[PDB]
What we know:
Chain A: It is found in: Cytoplasm. Chain B is an alpha+beta fold.
Amino acid sequence: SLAPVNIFKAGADEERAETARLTSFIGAIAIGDLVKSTLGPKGMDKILLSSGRDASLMVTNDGATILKNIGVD
Amino acid sequence: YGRPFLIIKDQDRKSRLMGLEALKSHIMAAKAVANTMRTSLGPNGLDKMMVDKDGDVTVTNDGATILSMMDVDHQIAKLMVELSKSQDDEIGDGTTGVVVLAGALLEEAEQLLDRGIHPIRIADGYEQAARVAIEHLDKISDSVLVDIKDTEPLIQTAKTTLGSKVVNSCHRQMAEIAVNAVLTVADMERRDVDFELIKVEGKVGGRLEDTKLIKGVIVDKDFSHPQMPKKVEDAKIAILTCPFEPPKPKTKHKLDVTSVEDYKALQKYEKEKFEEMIQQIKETGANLAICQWGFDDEANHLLLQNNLPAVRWVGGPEIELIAIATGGRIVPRFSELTAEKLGFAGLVQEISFGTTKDKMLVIEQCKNSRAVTIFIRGGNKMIIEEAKRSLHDALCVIRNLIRDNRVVYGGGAAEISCALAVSQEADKCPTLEQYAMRAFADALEVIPMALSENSGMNPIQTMTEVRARQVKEMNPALGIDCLHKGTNDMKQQHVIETLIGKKQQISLATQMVRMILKIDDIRKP
Amino acid sequence: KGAYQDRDKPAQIRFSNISAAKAVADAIRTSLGPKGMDKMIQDGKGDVTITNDGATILKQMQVLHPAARMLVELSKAQDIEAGDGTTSVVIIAGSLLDSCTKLLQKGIHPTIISESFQKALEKGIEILTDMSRPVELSDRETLLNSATTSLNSKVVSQYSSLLSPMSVNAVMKVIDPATATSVDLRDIKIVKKLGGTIDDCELVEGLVLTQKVSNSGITRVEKAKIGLIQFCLSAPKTDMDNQIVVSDYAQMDRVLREERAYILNLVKQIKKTGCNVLLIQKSILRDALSDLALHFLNKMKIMVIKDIEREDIEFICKTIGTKPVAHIDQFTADMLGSAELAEEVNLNGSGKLLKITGCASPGKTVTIVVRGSNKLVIEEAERSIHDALCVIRCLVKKRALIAGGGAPEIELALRLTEYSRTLSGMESYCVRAFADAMEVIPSTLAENAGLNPISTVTELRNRHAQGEKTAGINVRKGGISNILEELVVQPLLVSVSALTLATETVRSILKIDDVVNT
Amino acid sequence: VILLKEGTDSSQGIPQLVSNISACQVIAEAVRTTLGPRGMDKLIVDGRGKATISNDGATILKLLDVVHPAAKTLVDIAKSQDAEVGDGTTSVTLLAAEFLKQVKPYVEEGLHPQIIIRAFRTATQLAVNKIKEIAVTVKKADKVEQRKLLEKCAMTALSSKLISQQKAFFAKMVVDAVMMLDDLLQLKMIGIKKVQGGALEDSQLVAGVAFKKTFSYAGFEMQPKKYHNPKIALLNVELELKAEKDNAEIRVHTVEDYQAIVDAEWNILYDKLEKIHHSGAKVVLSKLPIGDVATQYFADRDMFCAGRVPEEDLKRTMMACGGSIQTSVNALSADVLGRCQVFEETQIGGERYNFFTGCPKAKTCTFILRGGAEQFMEETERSLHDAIMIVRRAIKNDSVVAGGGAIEMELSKYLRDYSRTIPGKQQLLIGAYAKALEIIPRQLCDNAGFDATNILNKLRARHAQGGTWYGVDINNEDIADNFEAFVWEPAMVRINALTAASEAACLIVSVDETIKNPRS
Ligand SMILES: Nc1ncnc2c1ncn2[C@@H]1O[C@H](COP(=O)(O)OP(=O)(O)O)[C@@H](O)[C@H]1O
Ligand SMILES: Nc1ncnc2c1ncn2[C@@H]1O[C@H](COP(=O)(O)OP(=O)(O)O)[C@@H](O)[C@H]1O
Ligand SMILES: Nc1ncnc2c1ncn2[C@@H]1O[C@H](COP(=O)(O)OP(=O)(O)O)[C@@H](O)[C@H]1O
Ligand SMILES: [Mg+2]
Ligand SMILES: [Mg+2]
Ligand SMILES: [Mg+2]
């Protein structure tokens, strides 16, 4: 917690200020901007391409599978 | 001598902290933990978003749960986590309160020992002040009525508990379902509540308003052989353990079929065994059969064409809950299934949960059912988990009130009254020990300060004004107006804390801070 | 209801600064008062020091936090302004920052705390002024008391009976005690040489040189006529390019004879003025002394001191009353320094020291030579002597004397708490915290002496509440007693400067809300 | 070729012995700050990350990883003192280190180790004799005074622990747990069960037997949890479907025989259960697991079952109720089933605990001690074990002696007086022994933040002629009659501490050379 003693672990961290809501807001807005270009009858669909086993490729417009397939952090 | 001698194995890497510096480090870690837990306190507090090593996320306000998932390495932080978990175990409410109180007490202890006072003296003063506070808390409490006829005080207490949690979006039906579930399950004669009879089950979809309390049993199965009817009316049920398969002894065995006549006899034995099984299921008159261990295709078809719906693969605890709800008996063999051993079901229905393939059964009872089930629905897995832990908090509060019957008017009023009692006692006390008493008073009185700070008001001035109000008019039910409705009086606002919860908070925090103060030396690799 | 103040980094930075300041204060807390024991600092290179002065401890210790660096600058500023209290000012600043951390936790804006601290300081300065008593010079007893008090918390305390009277005599023999308004410590030359013990320290009204006599035939001079030289006693050479061309065999004889005659002429003009000891300035680009020149000087029975630093000419002239010469034509006895005796003393095999003593001309300068077994005690002894000199300088600056041993700050704490009790508002808590954060000094004096801090501070507060002013901690009695009868006093300027400097630097620290790496 | 293997390290002479002595003081410094009511606490972090918090010499010294043989001797003396009398583990370590420190000045010059060993032996023999001949015994054999003596000894034992503020609550409590034991004082007959949650004063002493809910099957939570005069069927047989012999092979050739054998397995299980039920017992217990079929069988007949109980808890139930464990079921007689006043399953801190309370003739006990953290309850259990051990040892003879450094000062004065008649060099060594025995009050004062020298001088002046039993009163910051202040200790702890410390000092001194092999 920025105190001159660190207690969590070698790899564990804490964001207990406007940093946490900053990260949450930017992540949520990034997801929303990713989905934004697929609305209305004039929306245009996207390509989902894998980076590994069998290199699965799917063309889709609905946001459910778009958000399911990609790996959010 | 010149030679440096080695006494401890691998002593070139071990670290040691001794004296007052170690106590400073302990107090500092405790202060960090308390500061982390301070923001998420009171109705205006904010949740915390914990992600585990697997990456799965959960948003929660329960202090015990937050600290349990807090992957922390400092030993004092581990002790604080154990404090919070133990407070959750004994009471179920006030898990953040103990952490905040311990942090405040340790901070005051640091301020005191800066003036060269022995830590054991601080611990003794903390113990004396804790005794005074508990005595005053028992003196100040009043009782509610734990009865079905006038259940409203139970709703008030559960609604006060459900505050500061997302389920306060509803905030009225949650308290109702918690009170009803605990009242139904509770054994009033022994004043004992069993939490194994409240199968809190959740499922995504719907809204948080759909969370209901079935006076029966919900199970995550479906009617085998889907051709059978999807619902039955008030039906006689046959809770069963043995599968619908031909028997076999547990002892290893060999059945030598030495001739074609033996083969035909074995075939006839198997077929007639199925037929007799179904016939002696039907003869009892039960409409619904339930099996723990599942069964095969022939049993499915015989059950179907005999107009006897059934389900399979029901778990052990689910079997026990079904049998308790329906009033029947679990029988392990078909040959001992009598009419008396059936149970009653108000109605058994199948539900589909929208477009998903998942199905469930609901068993509703027209008679007294000692078991219930809280069904939770929502739009997120995080919402579902937070809702079920919040309802567990409410159930724990309700059962605590069943087993104690006494309440205090929370919202900071209890802490302020205890602080005034502690200070008044410390007035007429010989010196060299009143400093610890006043430090205890301030440390326990920080809770209204944190409550007001979370509420957005100025902490110090509001706290001083409400304390002055409490000391002027002898009304010890004046607390922080956290929700901003005026009326510093907390009787009208209907805020209820359980007496055992607060006294457990005080005692447990005092004992933990005594242990922390006792520690002197740390040797760690 | 109110501003959300979403940003939390300012609060974290403020608490980090307060924690660092408190840690730095606690580090040297145990090095305060007569019973405080000094610290030992060894820097990156294998050089060590045994320091009790707070300024030195903080400077040698290479800190890394900005609050710590501001505190060390505060300590050095307090040393510059007063010279004593460089530990107490840091302790006060850290302690009242630790006091104000809970004010920050109570929901108080930093500006209100800063303004209230300014008001508390304003009241405290008046409290200290009222508590004091006038002090006037030529009263050697109170000067000795102040010097002994300044030296009590140092290693040389047991030597203070043979080291404080000379410490105050040094100041009294430099400045006129009638119309001074200030003194200078530059003209107090502290010369340190290894060897002997502390009881061998000396104060000389004359001049001390670490230089060595070139002609090892003459050691002592009675009725010395000292003359500084700023030119060179070597073969002539012009500022611009110098060249001599020889084309005949007689020319070598001519140039050798002429150079010898020129040097002999210079030495004869030097000798005919009655000068019997010569001081040659350290000259480069031209040999200050030639072997032939030194031979002639020795022949005419003179003592020669060469390689004298340029920056020391002013000191020598102010000491022995001589005037420098940069041209031989202006070398006359009418402006030649005079002294009763010039001696070169071997210091029991530890060194060779030159003394010019009994200068007939008046000398507004004295020199202290400090002796010790090892170098560490010598460094600490010269630092302690400097502290005593700075205390006397404080006494000269403004004539106000107060008691010590915890009495001034505890009386200030009582008076300021009573003043805070009549300041209802959001500043009442801040003035109360300022008042109760100045009890750290008596508590530290109590706990460093092995006393009971709680009972000692409580009895001190009780004693000062009844108006028994100038009552403080006594370590000879091991309790609380009147301090004036115990002969422990300090000038008021030290306390006032400490309080004011600490308050100003704490307000500056409170004004901080962010740190960024450049 | 060299005589020994390469890497062999040998040390000989005076410097080796002085280094061993210094190692002894360094290892005894680790537990020095854990004496008396103002004693502090030690936290030791293992290599696995688990932290143990305690303030007894034995546990702290064991937790410390020691590889120095002399420090190993100190560890062994602490552990042996723990294993003999239970209380006084820090005293033995401090006494040994102080003996060695006091004598090292004399060993710096050429003093033969045999003479100082002989001096220790004589001094310790005289000290043990004096302790035997000074300790007072009431010699009344009355129950009220015996109870008071045991309560005061237990209270003095609980001081300097985590359970100090609740001494009186726990002390008399453990006395009861020793009152209700048979004339064997077995330590397995009083159990300690630790459960999270609750305050320190919420702990209780079950006079029957209590144990955590072992396990349950589909059919539990149906049989009643409250019986008012039941009979306990202690068993050692598993009641569930299983192979008869784990190698039995069934060989048949007709379906009728197959059905008969299936019904036969069911019939043998049901006949065993019928024997158990017809025995008249209402609640049954078994070391071996109880299947779901037996759970439902006992649920259908208002009978409580509890399988997989631990061996120790089942033997405690035997000693409480007064039954006997039957491996066989054919002989459930009426004098083998134990009976209890009340059986009840209750909720304690997130766990279910079965209680058999009200047993009239109980020779066992159970400690339900509460706490906030696992280390809190573990340290409470350590303190309780210390107290029960001291009461167990004191029950054999009620000869007591004043604590708080009074006995150490008395022996120091006796040895100082004795070491004036003896001529020669042994006088100096016995005086060193007495000055070393003077350590305990000094360390108590140091831990309490006193003026140790002043209090020691006051003790010496008041105790040369002003009367024995005078130790240090911590609360009053002074000296006081600790026997009249009810600070009592059994004399055996001081006797054992002195003899062990003498033995360890002699063993450490009697070494002149050490060898370390390359530890292949
Ligand atoms: N409506 C309210 N008004 C004022 N104070 C409240 C109100 N509801 C709860 N509180 C206070 O908030 C504190 C914390 O409650 P909460 O965060 O809901 O659970 P926990 O006690 O586990 O932290 C309690 O001590 C209670 O007194
Ligand atoms: N003999 C003494 N008795 C009591 N207090 C003393 C004595 N000598 C010094 N003090 C106190 O110790 C404090 C620290 O003084 P000192 O360590 O000499 O310099 P600094 O003030 O720079 O630390 C002073 O405030 C003074 O009041
Ligand atoms: N109430 C008391 N007052 C003074 N001294 C006490 C008191 N209780 C115990 N002691 C002292 O503490 C010492 C033992 O400390 P403790 O840590 O309790 O046991 P151990 O001997 O295992 O260290 C004894 O020598 C005894 O004299
Ligand atoms: Mg709550
Ligand atoms: Mg000074
Ligand atoms: Mg003990």
